[PDB]
Subunit: 150 residues, 12 copies
């Protein structure tokens, strides 16, 4: 129960971020309009599944550690730090810029936890290190759209 | 814009209920313990996908009608009427009883909308009528567990 | 069969609308060019699939009703629906704008046949109710690419 | 509940029809001979699975409505209002003709249930309305065979 | 031919058993409730398809032997020597117990046919010997449930 | 591109032949009846698939050559090829006999375009050489159903 | 080497019958014409694969026993007893009648071997007993065509 | 009937060579022993299917042309020119050397026919040109085994 | 159940033979080296699959008979069958020779259990009859790699 | 290779733990009975799959390191880990309780090898880090079935 | 043999083109940015596999013709007559324009080989004629992007 | 950013290794002859796809880190520190021996990068650590061939 409790808490934070993340991901998928919006749909779909699956992993890891994971809407806002995605019906430029911002928080938060799990739980850390690869790759695809010349 | 606006609103309610629903569904999947918890996992998994897909349908129907659908956590609690699933680490009996309750609201709410869409939009109604079939069947599987003799 | 004759007549118009539709749909696929034409390709492919399928259902339903379904080119330009598609090799917006109007008539015609079937054949009605949803959803995606005039 | 018992009762009549139907579908499959029985084999197979699935759908709908669905041979006999299918080893013509008559009842009974369910249960009605389309479509393929 | 009519007759008794069996399998599927009915759902499904397939195998074997296989509800009643399955909405315990008894007969009847076919038709015998393995294997899973 | 213009012209005729062909092919599918009609169903289904595919290849080739491919109903009845199919609900032989003649023209026209392409475009020629094989093989199966007049 | 040699010989006979069988099967597939010839194709195809596979089994069993199996054309006629299928371009009635005859020999020959292997090799016998099931079922489908009333 | 008759004859020759070929192919598959015999099995299997399929193509092309194709064992030896594979239980070296020889005849014979079909039937020629690619590639894999240094 | 006890006893020996077999089979897979070791890999993989499957059948049959099947390591070295496999990292022939002898005992033991079951349980017998065929076929392939001493 | 020798040694213990593990895992599968035994079946099947796979990875890694991996029964009971599984035909809780303890040792041993590998081989460490996650997740599911003593 | 060495030589030039092509295809895939790079991603992927497969087809054809096919980076440089693709992170417009020019050469070189092979090897020619169709089809999709 | 440019640089060296590697893998595939070249064919195929995929993974990682990944033949030559693979049509023994030496460098270079990335980028390191396992596993199968 020693450090496991502490790790379990770190994961809960991650759990709420993922839930909030795939909800948001879906939200923009539904509200993006404009010329190149099919490409955005194409790009979001797989990420939504990846993140949803990461929520399952993170959640099942919290339970394996001994605590009870929370996935209800209330727990999402309680844990939440990143306000609430506020861009609605809009273009690819607006939603991508906003999403890039969302990922800065997600990636930065994931890096810290990986750093914090170094001496608590290698397994749980490896879990986060695997997620960071896709989280960061995705942000790049997002950024790549906002570069009409680079 | 006439009645479409009104239909679009009815759907938004449904959209938030579904989002809250698959989040909750997942929450119990993660927190159910006890002897017959594998059967509960088995039963929940497909429902989580069905409901998630219904969220996409309902959401894409709101946009098709002309309004902007909301899937962020904030919109879920704003629209929300059914509090916030409060059963955590627990047995199959407790979670199923709670879920049966959750579905009473979901099914009852879906029936009204189907009733209200009768003279507004047959298509959107057919969408809800298709969902009601699975929503109700699922509740029965849930109830079936709580019947150790019937 | 008297009402069966009417219903069949109604479906025949729908059939010809569907045939002209997938011919037209494919026509644009082969003629859309521009920086984002591929997004439109990936949008049309499954719609052609669906509409070719809908034509089969309507044709088979008509036969089921005891009438001979007509699918020859002469039959199509007779029942007709819209001016023989006049956009050749052109931009994405030029094509999508045209497509939008083509879908306005399809959806309107579908809406009317559904009302007329209300008191004639619940099964044939159900067929169009099912069709309307995807037909409307598709226009939506076409319109999503368009966003001018404020 | 008192309006749902009415829906459960209809459905059980519908459930027994499906069971007797997919058994009969297999029976004709096993006994059709003649130059083109192969095609009738192909035509019946997917229908058998469709109807076997429809039986499942209705039985589950009955249990959802709080009643106990009946699927034993005895249940079929009790509910059955028609005569046991009586064609044995025979021509494609003979079976397809008998089957045409069978689907006349199946379809007529389904429409009457779709008609009653109208003011009782729109969800249960939707279930049958969906079935109807397939049952009637299948009867056409049976009939197309009969028009030499 | 006079030794093949004997094989066709056995098989028809076997064919009616399978039909009554896969109908009953579905029936219990539709009526099991309780904490662990989900598993019994999973356990019955593949068995249902296996038995539905076995019915097909036997019916075709009968037609191959020159006789007309019977698969209608009426055929089942005529051939049936057992009582219609009588358990309705009930516990997993109740159905699995009733089913255990059902498979006792199914298996006993199959061995007697495997025993007669010995000197009548080795190919038909091989068909049943193959079925037996699955029928008995399935009865064990039913029984494993009963040993609390 | 001068020869490219000719080649493209040649393909356009082929395209319209293919469009009329799968429309016609499907027309008979919906109208064949008789004791062995299903054998004809199973014969036509993959042929419609193939011909719809061939039209796509020819259309894309034409575009590849710098021309705008035409696939509208008006385009089809203009280039035309055979009298608008005139067999409605009829027997298998009645339909197959008609189909046979329709294929005589297709195959003949293909044979000629292949000769003309001999010295213009080996790639477009190769496309028709490939098409001819299945087109001819199909007529064969149609004729196999027919065997009268000794 | 004792009885294995004898069993190995019995199998070689079977091997040549199978090879001759799938060749013949294919021959009629190619030469059957008439109304219901699609059904015959449909029926033959799977049998051709089954029999071809039985040739592999029987052949690999001969090698496993210690002898060298022969699949060349010469070995087929040497072992052959049933002349050489002599029906060419022809109808379903003619080819089926001929095939029924071919199977009488095949089935009768298979029964004897099963009978002869009873005290030589149970495994090799089980192999033949499995084949007999399909060989006999197939003959029935063949006979079923020649019964326009039964 | 003019040249088609002549082409039909050329194909029959090819048909018998293929039949004899896949029989032989299978024969060596069953009789190859030694260290690297798995690789030989691996290599033969796909060729056996390819060649069997080529027999179907060639055969269906003969019928499409108007003649009756022959696949019975008798026709194989009548048409046959290449004696009868005489290597039995043996090593990879022996069987491969023999097979290389078999293919020299097959490839050389195929080249002539392609050459002879140049002014008779382009379609039938294309059929043979497609086969030659695989026939020749296969011979190379065979030769590659007999090169323990090259 | 008296005979059921004997039969079960018989199967238990078979079970342990199968467990030692797939453990041993996998042992060599990991230790075979040499120029043609991969051919042996591809040979063993499906055999391990099959034998692991056979163990499941025998185990389940034993339970079906009312006995407790034993699959622990202690159970295996008790019933035993052959000297704990003693070939480590070695050549292909060294391993295959050893494998050959291991299969001689398996096949012999199977042959005996099949005779003993003759008058006890036709179903359990049928199970081994089925197993014997693949077990023997596998030895064959092992022996095919070997061909020394004339 | 000195450290490579140590690492290999470490993996060999892991290998034997994995072999005993899937043998034991399968042992219980065949011996679990009770009202909810099937839930345990469906829980064990993929775990056996995984553990058999892990053994292959560890075995191949050991060989990759230049050592001979040992997978014989004698090797397993030598390295050993826990008392030869002693629960035969028994209840679900009786089996799962035992399984729980077996997994405590596996996970602990894995945890230690991962620490020891920290400074010897990052790749072999990564292998166990990957294994630990599923091994621990599985214990979790086993423990989820258990919930006594408050 | 002396007429086959000519075919092997052509093909090696063709083999080096394909290798440099599927490497370049991946390179543009990795460096396209802008509003619609996703589509260009989708468009390039299947082409990459097609060309990687074509490289295989030609290399095997060369070995079949008795020569040793060359596929190392050094082989590419030796055979290469064009300049290394030089566009880095850049707009879809920039890469698709550069690629259009690349396929101009690829297609022109393929037709000249199809033209020589005419009297040398009809089978090898058939191989390239098949490739050409895909290479030219792909160049059209590249160009359709350029016509704003 | 100044610590990420270091990671991007390493990776580009790694990216050029993979490209030269999957080209070379294909090259040996095309030129192995002898009694058991078929197996070496099977062994190389999945490795080729694995390495082609790894090239993609690294290139994308470089673009994610803000740099432009280089995949053209010229890029390979520039980064390449080893000699172009020089074995032509030759025995399985000859290629597998040469390949063993090739993977010695590939693996040694990958460990040094895994070692540097330790304090630079744990995510990029994780990427290579994953690759290493496959690269080393593949080198063992190459070596197992060499131990006659």
């Amino acid at each position: 129960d020693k450090k496991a409790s502490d790790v379990a808490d770190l994961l809960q934070k991650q759990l709420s971020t993922y839930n909030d993340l795939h909800l948001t991901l879906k939200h923009v998928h539904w509200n993006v309009v404009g010329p190149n919006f099919i490409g955005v749909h194409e790009m979001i779909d797989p990420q939504v599944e990846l993140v949803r699956g990461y929520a399952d992993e993170v959640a099942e890891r919290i339970a394996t550690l001994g605590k009870s994971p929370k996935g209800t809407p209330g727990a999402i806002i309680k844990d939440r730090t990143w306000d609430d995605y506020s861009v609605e019906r809009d273009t690819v430029q607006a939603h991508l810029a906003a999403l890039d911002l969302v990922y800065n928080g997600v990636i930065e938060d994931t890096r810290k936890s990986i750093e914090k799990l170094e001496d608590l739980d290698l397994v749980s850390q490896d879990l986060l290190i695997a997620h960071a690869g896709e989280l960061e790759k995705f942000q790049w695809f997002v950024r790549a759209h906002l570069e009409s010349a680079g």
